[PDB]
Write a protein that binds this ligand. Structure first.
Ligand SMILES: [Cl-]
Length: 75
C-alpha cells in the first residue's frame, strides 16, 4: 500500500505527478517545487539557491511513475 521512496517528492511528501531533476541530481514534483520556490523565493528545503529555469523533466522516471500508476490504480 506504501508508495515507493523513489517516487516521493521531498516537498509534497507524496507521489510525484511530473518528476523534474536538478543539476545537483535531486528529484522533485514539478508543481510542488514551483509553488515552494515561490513561497521561499528560490530556496530549496535545505535553504540553498534554486531556480525553476535550471531543472529539466526527468523523462525515464516519468515513464516509471506511469507504470507504477497502472499497478496502483489496478487495486
Ligand atoms: Cl530512476
Amino acid at each position: 500500500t506504501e508508495i515507493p521512496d523513489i517516487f516521493l517528492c521531498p516537498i509534497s511528501k507524496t507521489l510525484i505527478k511530473t518528476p523534474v531533476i536538478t543539476a545537483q541530481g535531486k528529484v522533485y514534483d514539478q508543481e510542488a517545487l514551483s509553488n515552494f520556490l515561490i513561497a521561499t523565493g528560490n530556496k530549496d528545503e535545505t535553504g540553498k539557491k534554486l531556480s525553476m529555469d535550471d531543472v529539466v523533466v526527468f523523462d525515464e522516471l516519468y515513464q516509471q511513475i506511469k507504470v507504477y500508476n497502472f499497478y496502483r490504480k489496478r487495486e
